Design an enzyme around this catalytic site. Structure first.
Site, PDB file in Angstrom:
ATOM      1  N   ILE A  15       0.868  -1.164   0.000  1.00  0.00           N
ATOM      2  CA  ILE A  15       0.000   0.000   0.000  1.00  0.00           C
ATOM      3  C   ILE A  15       0.920   1.233   0.000  1.00  0.00           C
ATOM      4  CG2 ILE A  15      -1.232   1.209   1.871  1.00  0.00           C
ATOM      5  CD1 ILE A  15      -3.196  -1.121   2.108  1.00  0.00           C
ATOM      6  N   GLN A  19       5.191   5.674   8.748  1.00  0.00           N
ATOM      7  CA  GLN A  19       6.186   6.248   9.668  1.00  0.00           C
ATOM      8  C   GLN A  19       7.076   5.162  10.297  1.00  0.00           C
ATOM      9  OE1 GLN A  19       4.722   9.114  12.823  1.00  0.00           O
ATOM     10  NE2 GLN A  19       6.632   8.545  13.843  1.00  0.00           N
ATOM     11  N   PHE A  20       6.463   4.044  10.727  1.00  0.00           N
ATOM     12  CA  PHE A  20       7.186   2.963  11.392  1.00  0.00           C
ATOM     13  C   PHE A  20       7.618   1.814  10.480  1.00  0.00           C
ATOM     14  CE2 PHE A  20       3.660   4.524  14.238  1.00  0.00           C
ATOM     15  CZ  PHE A  20       4.397   5.367  15.043  1.00  0.00           C
ATOM     16  N   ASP A 128      -3.423  12.165  20.312  1.00  0.00           N
ATOM     17  CA  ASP A 128      -2.933  12.810  19.104  1.00  0.00           C
ATOM     18  C   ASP A 128      -3.969  12.759  17.990  1.00  0.00           C
ATOM     19  OD1 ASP A 128      -0.974  14.208  17.572  1.00  0.00           O
ATOM     20  OD2 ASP A 128      -0.032  12.337  16.895  1.00  0.00           O
TER      21      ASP A 128
HETATM   22  C1  QWS Z   1       0.873   4.115   3.913  1.00  0.00           C
HETATM   23  C2  QWS Z   1       0.328   5.334   3.199  1.00  0.00           C
HETATM   24  C3  QWS Z   1       1.359   6.433   3.311  1.00  0.00           C
HETATM   25  O1  QWS Z   1       0.216   5.043   1.806  1.00  0.00           O
HETATM   26  C4  QWS Z   1      -1.056   4.669   1.379  1.00  0.00           C
HETATM   27  C5  QWS Z   1      -1.236   4.685   0.011  1.00  0.00           C
HETATM   28  C6  QWS Z   1      -2.445   4.297  -0.527  1.00  0.00           C
HETATM   29  C7  QWS Z   1      -3.463   3.868   0.297  1.00  0.00           C
HETATM   30  C8  QWS Z   1      -4.658   3.489  -0.280  1.00  0.00           C
HETATM   31  C9  QWS Z   1      -5.708   3.072   0.513  1.00  0.00           C
HETATM   32  C10 QWS Z   1      -5.551   3.018   1.882  1.00  0.00           C
HETATM   33  C11 QWS Z   1      -4.359   3.405   2.465  1.00  0.00           C
HETATM   34  N1  QWS Z   1      -4.280   3.296   3.871  1.00  0.00           N
HETATM   35  C12 QWS Z   1      -4.804   2.269   4.612  1.00  0.00           C
HETATM   36  C13 QWS Z   1      -4.519   2.542   5.933  1.00  0.00           C
HETATM   37  N2  QWS Z   1      -4.852   1.780   7.051  1.00  0.00           N
HETATM   38  C14 QWS Z   1      -5.940   0.918   7.044  1.00  0.00           C
HETATM   39  N3  QWS Z   1      -6.305   0.569   8.320  1.00  0.00           N
HETATM   40  O2  QWS Z   1      -6.522   0.534   6.026  1.00  0.00           O
HETATM   41  C15 QWS Z   1      -3.832   3.781   5.901  1.00  0.00           C
HETATM   42  C16 QWS Z   1      -3.320   4.525   7.025  1.00  0.00           C
HETATM   43  N4  QWS Z   1      -2.852   5.775   6.693  1.00  0.00           N
HETATM   44  O3  QWS Z   1      -3.345   4.073   8.161  1.00  0.00           O
HETATM   45  N5  QWS Z   1      -3.699   4.233   4.646  1.00  0.00           N
HETATM   46  C17 QWS Z   1      -3.299   3.843   1.680  1.00  0.00           C
HETATM   47  C18 QWS Z   1      -2.088   4.256   2.210  1.00  0.00           C
END
Ligand code: QWS
Ligand code: QWS
Length: 263
Positions: A15, A19-20, A128
């Site tokens: 995906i 950060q971690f 936060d």
């Molecule tokens: C990790 C981030 C920077 O990159 C992405 C890129 C595309 C994404 C597309 C769909 C969803 C994303 N996505 C999914 C997440 N967590 C869960 N629980 O589904 C998060 C998050 N920021 O916690 N971001 C995505 C997150």
């Protein structure tokens, strides 16, 4: 149990890089599609975190992202969450800027407020709360995530009120001065989150350093009213930013006030 064996998870797609560590889309055996976050060794106090798992696994609400379990057989460990198809709220607002009805923006605030009223009743402090920590799911539902995580983060420059990376833009005065966290300090953060929502993802106090935000807030200055926020909505934001925590509304009160405004 909250322990997920490695044999129960399959990574399907990367995906992105968080950060971690990495974040993958994957499947959890006999359960569901999930988001799996790989945590770099040293980023969090893993022993402290796992001590609260049996208690924290009981929290469940439609407006909270569910953290199903932890895969910890070997490092780096993985946290397994409910998959939120549209990603973080801050990016979602910025990419769709100009396409939001004012009612939809108020609805997003109401989803967050409902999740926070559940955490407040549960006596769980987020610490936060920000648009970057809220996630967008099916049919644009907003859910709160990462509550309480700063108690496990090992970067002192982020967690200490005197740290160079402290998230002062969302911090109430008692948090930036004394790390005095409460559901009332989360109410202050929620007011800033409302501003982020109604500003369609603008950065609060973008033209200020951390010390300048502390000086501005302490001298009574507040974020300006976003074009899309009605005067009634902005009034509620200002109630969240009252200097004294005792003068701020509880999330239970905010939820009733914002729902009356919406309906
Ligand atoms: C990790 C981030 C920077 O990159 C992405 C890129 C595309 C994404 C597309 C769909 C969803 C994303 N996505 C999914 C997440 N967590 C869960 N629980 O589904 C998060 C998050 N920021 O916690 N971001 C995505 C997150
Ligand atoms: C496997 C999980 C339940 O273990 C923990 C352990 C410690 C925790 C400490 C603070 C907060 C936790 N926490 C965080 C959660 N969700 C998200 N999206 O961040 C949940 C949950 N029940 O959905 N519990 C914790 C969750």
């Amino acid at each position: 149990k909250w322990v997920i064996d490695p044999s129960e998870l399959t990574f399907v797609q990367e995906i992105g890089s968080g950060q971690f560590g990495l974040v993958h889309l994957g499947y959890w055996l006999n359960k569901d599609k999930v988001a799996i976050k790989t945590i770099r060794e040293g980023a969090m106090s893993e022993e402290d975190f796992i001590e609260e798992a049996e208690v924290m696994m009981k929290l469940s609400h439609p407006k909270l992202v569910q953290l199903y379990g932890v895969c910890l057989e070997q490092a780096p460990i993985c946290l397994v969450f409910e998959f939120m198809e549209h990603g973080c709220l801050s990016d979602y607002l910025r990419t769709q800027r100009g396409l939001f009805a004012a009612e939809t923006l108020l609805g997003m605030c109401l989803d967050v407020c409902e999740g926070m009223a559940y955490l407040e009743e549960a006596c769980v402090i987020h610490r936060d709360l920000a648009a970057r920590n809220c996630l967008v799911g099916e049919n644009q539902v907003i859910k709160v995530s990462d509550f309480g995580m700063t108690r496990f983060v090992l970067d002192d420059q982020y967690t200490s009120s005197t740290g160079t990376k402290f998230p002062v833009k969302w911090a109430s005065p008692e948090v930036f001065s004394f790390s005095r966290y409460s559901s009332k300090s989360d109410v202050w953060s929620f007011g800033v989150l409302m501003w982020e929502v109604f500003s369609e993802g603008k950065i609060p106090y973008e033209n200020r350093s951390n010390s300048e935000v502390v000086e501005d807030i302490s001298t009574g200055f507040r974020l300006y009213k976003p074009r899309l926020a009605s005067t009634h909505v902005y009034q509620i934001m200002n109630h969240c930013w009252r200097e004294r925590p005792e003068d701020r509304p509880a999330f239970s009160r905010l939820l009733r006030q914002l729902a009356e405004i919406a309906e």
